[PDB]
Short mmCIF file of C-alpha atoms and ligand atoms in Angstrom, two decimals:
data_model
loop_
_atom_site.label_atom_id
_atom_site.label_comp_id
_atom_site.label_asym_id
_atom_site.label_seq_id
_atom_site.Cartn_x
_atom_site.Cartn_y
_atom_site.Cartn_z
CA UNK A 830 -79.13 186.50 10.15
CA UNK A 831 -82.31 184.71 9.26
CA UNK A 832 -83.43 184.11 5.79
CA UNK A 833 -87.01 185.07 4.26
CA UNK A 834 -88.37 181.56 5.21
CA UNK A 835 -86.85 181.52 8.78
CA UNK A 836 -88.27 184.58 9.84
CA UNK A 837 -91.83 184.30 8.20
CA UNK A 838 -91.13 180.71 10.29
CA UNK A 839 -90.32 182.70 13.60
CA UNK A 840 -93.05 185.06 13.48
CA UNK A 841 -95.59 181.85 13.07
CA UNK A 842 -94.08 180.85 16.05
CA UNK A 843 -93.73 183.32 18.18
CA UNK A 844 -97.93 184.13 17.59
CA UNK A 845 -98.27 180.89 19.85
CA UNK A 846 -97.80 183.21 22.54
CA UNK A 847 -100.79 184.58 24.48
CA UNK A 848 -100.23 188.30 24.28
CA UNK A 849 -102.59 189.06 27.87
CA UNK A 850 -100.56 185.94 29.52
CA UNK A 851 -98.09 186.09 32.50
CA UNK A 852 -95.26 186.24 30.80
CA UNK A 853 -91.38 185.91 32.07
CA UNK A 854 -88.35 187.26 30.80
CA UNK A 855 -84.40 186.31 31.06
CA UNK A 856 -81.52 186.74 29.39
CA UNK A 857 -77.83 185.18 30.35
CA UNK A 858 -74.82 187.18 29.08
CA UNK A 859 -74.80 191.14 29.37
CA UNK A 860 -77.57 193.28 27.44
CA UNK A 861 -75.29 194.48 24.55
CA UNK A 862 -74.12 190.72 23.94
CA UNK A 863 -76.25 188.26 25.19
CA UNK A 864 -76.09 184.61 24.96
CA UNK A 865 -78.75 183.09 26.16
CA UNK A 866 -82.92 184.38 26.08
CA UNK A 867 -85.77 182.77 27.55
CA UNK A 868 -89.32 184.43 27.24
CA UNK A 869 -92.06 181.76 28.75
CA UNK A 870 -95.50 181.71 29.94
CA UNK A 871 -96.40 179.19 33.36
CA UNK A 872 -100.05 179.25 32.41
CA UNK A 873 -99.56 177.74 29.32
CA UNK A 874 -96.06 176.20 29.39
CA UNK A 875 -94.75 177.45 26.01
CA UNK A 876 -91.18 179.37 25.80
CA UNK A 877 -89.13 181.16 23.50
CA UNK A 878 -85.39 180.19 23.97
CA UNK A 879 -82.37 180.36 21.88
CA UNK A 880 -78.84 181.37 22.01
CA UNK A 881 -76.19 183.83 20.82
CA UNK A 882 -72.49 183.64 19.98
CA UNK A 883 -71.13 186.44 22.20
CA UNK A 884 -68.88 189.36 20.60
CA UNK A 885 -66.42 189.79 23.29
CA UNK A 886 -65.08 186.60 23.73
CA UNK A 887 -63.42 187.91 26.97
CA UNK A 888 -66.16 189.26 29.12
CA UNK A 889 -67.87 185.85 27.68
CA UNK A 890 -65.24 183.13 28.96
CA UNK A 891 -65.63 185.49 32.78
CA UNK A 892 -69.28 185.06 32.48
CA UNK A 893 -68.83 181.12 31.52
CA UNK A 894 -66.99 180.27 34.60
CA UNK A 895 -69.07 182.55 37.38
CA UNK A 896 -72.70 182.31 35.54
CA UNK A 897 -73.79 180.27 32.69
CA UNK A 898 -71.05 177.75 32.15
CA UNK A 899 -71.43 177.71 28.66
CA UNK A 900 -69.07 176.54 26.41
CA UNK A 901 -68.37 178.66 23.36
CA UNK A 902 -67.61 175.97 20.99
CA UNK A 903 -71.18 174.91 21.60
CA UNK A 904 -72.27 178.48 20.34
CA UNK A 905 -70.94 178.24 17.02
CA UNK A 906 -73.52 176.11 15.65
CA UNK A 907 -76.30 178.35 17.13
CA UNK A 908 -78.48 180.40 14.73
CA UNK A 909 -77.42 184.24 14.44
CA UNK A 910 -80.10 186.86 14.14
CA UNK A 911 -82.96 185.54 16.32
CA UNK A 912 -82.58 187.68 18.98
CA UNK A 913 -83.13 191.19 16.92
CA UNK A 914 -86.10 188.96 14.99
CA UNK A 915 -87.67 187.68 18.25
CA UNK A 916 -87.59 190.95 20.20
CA UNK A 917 -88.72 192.94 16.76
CA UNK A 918 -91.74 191.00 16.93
CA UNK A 919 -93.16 190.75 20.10
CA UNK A 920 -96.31 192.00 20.58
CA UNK A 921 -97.01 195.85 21.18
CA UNK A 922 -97.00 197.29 24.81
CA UNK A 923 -96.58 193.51 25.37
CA UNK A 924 -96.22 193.11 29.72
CA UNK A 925 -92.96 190.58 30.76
CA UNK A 926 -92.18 189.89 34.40
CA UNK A 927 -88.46 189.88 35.19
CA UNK A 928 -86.23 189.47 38.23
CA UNK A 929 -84.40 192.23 38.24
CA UNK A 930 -85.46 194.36 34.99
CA UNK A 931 -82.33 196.68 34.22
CA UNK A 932 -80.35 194.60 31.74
CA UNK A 933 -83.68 193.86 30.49
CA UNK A 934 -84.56 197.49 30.10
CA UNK A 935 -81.30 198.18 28.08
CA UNK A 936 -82.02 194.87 25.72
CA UNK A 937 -85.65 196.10 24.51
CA UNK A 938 -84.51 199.69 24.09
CA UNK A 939 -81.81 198.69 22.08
CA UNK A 940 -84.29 197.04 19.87
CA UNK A 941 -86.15 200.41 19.84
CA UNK A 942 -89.06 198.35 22.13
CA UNK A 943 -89.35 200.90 24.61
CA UNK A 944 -93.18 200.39 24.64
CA UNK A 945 -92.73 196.98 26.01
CA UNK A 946 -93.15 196.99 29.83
CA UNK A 947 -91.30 195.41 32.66
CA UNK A 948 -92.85 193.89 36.10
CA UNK A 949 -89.90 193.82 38.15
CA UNK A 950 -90.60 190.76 41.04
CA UNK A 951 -88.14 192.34 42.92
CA UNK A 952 -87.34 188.95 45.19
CA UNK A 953 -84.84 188.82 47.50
CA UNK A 954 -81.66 186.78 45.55
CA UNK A 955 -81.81 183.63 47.92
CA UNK A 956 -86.01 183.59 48.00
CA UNK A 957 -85.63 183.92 44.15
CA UNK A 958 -83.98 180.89 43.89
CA UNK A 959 -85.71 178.65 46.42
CA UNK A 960 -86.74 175.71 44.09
CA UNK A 961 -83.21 175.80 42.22
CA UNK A 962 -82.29 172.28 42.94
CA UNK A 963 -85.55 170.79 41.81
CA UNK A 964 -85.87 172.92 38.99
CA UNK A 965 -83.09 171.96 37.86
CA UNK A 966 -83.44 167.76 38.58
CA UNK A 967 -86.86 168.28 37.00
CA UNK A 968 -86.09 170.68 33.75
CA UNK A 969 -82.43 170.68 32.90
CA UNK A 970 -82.72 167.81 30.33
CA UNK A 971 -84.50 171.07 28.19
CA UNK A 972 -81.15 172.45 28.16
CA UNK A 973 -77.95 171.38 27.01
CA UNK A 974 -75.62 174.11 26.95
CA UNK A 975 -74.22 174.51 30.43
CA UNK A 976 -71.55 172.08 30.42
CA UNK A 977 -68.49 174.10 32.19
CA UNK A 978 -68.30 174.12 36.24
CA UNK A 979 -68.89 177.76 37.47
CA UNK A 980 -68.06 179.07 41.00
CA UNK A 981 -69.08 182.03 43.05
CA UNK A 982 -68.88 175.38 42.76
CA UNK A 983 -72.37 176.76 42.18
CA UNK A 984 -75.59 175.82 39.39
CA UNK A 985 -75.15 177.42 36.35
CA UNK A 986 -77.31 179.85 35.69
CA UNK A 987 -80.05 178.87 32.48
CA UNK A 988 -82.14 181.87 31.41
CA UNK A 989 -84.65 179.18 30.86
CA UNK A 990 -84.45 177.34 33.96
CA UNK A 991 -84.64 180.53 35.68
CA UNK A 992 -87.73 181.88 34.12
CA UNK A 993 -89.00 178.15 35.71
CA UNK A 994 -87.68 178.88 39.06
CA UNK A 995 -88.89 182.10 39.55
CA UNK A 996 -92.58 181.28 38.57
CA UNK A 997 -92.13 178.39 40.62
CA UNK A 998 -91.06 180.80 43.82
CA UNK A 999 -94.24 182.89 43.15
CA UNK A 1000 -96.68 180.52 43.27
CA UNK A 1001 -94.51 178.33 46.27
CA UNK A 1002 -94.41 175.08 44.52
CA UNK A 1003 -92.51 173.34 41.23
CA UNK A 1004 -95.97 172.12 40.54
CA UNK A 1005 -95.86 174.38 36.92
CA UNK A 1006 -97.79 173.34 33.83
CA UNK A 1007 -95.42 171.42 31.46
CA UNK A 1008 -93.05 173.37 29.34
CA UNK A 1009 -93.03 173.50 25.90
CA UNK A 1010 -90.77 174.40 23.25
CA UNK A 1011 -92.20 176.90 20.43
CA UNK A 1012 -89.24 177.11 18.02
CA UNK A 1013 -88.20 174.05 15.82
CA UNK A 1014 -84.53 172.91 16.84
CA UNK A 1015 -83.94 173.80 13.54
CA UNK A 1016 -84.65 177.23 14.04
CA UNK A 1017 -82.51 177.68 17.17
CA UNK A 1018 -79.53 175.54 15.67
CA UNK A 1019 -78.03 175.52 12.32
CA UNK A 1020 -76.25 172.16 12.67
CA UNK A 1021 -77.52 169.32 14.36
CA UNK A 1022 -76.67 167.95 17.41
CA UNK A 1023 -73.17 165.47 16.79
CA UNK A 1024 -74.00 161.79 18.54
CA UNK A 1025 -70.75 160.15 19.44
CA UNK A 1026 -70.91 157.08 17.51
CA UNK A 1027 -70.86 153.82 19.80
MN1 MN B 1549 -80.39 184.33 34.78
ZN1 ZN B 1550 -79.83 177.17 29.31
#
């Protein structure tokens, strides 16, 4: 996982965070191998989000072509460990809002984080995703990874970009505060990004 420097670097980072803030949660990929997690506050913009490499490669490539659309050669060059470091150090009895909260639930307790509660939104699947299309014409130049076509031909589902989508069905409008990034790329990735030379 992540060296000394990285994760004195992550826990820098992750105090950016307003610990009283709104704050969402979402994960792509199932609880005991996720791939995808996106913790970010509308008030302020800022987000958490990195990636995984999934264990089971099989439940993975089912989940690529009905979900995320992610490609696991994209994956490899992700940076393993964050998600264990991240969740570790969230802040105590820290409040998330979620849509739908039982995968959630199962994530934090695995990370012994039961005192970390979850605000379940509890909207209806269609009202949840209202805003999809211009969250996603707005937004999805913040993520790369969902390259694959997935069917249900549907949008892929970002944990990111959801997190977005859902604040902006709450308060009725895409007008959010902009989003910011609070890990380095270097942090998230351990290989750069390959330009095809032209
Ligand atoms: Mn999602
Ligand atoms: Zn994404």
């Amino acid at each position: 996982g992540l060296t000394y420097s990285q994760t004195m670097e992550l826990k820098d980072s992750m105090l950016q965070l307003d610990p009283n803030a709104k704050t969402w949660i979402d994960i792509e990929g199932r609880p005991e191998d996720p791939v995808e997690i996106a913790i970010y506050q509308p008030n302020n913009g800022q987000y958490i989000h990195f990636y995984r490499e999934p264990t089971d490669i099989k439940q993975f490539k089912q989940d690529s072509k009905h979900s995320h659309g992610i490609d696991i050669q994209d994956l490899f060059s992700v940076q393993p460990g964050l998600t264990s470091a991240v969740i570790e150090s969230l802040p105590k009895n820290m409040v998330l809002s979620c849509q739908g909260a039982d995968d959630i639930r199962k994530l934090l307790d695995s990370q012994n984080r039961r005192d970390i509660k979850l605000i379940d939104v509890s909207m209806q699947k269609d009202d949840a995703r209202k805003f999809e299309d211009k969250i996603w014409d707005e937004y999805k130049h913040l993520c790369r990874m969902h390259t694959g076509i997935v069917t249900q031909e549907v949008t892929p589902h970002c944990a990111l970009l959801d997190c977005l989508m859902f604040e902006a069905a709450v308060i009725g409008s895409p007008q959010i505060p902009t989003p910011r990034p609070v890990l380095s790329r270097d942090l998230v990735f351990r290989t750069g990004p390959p330009r095809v030379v032209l």
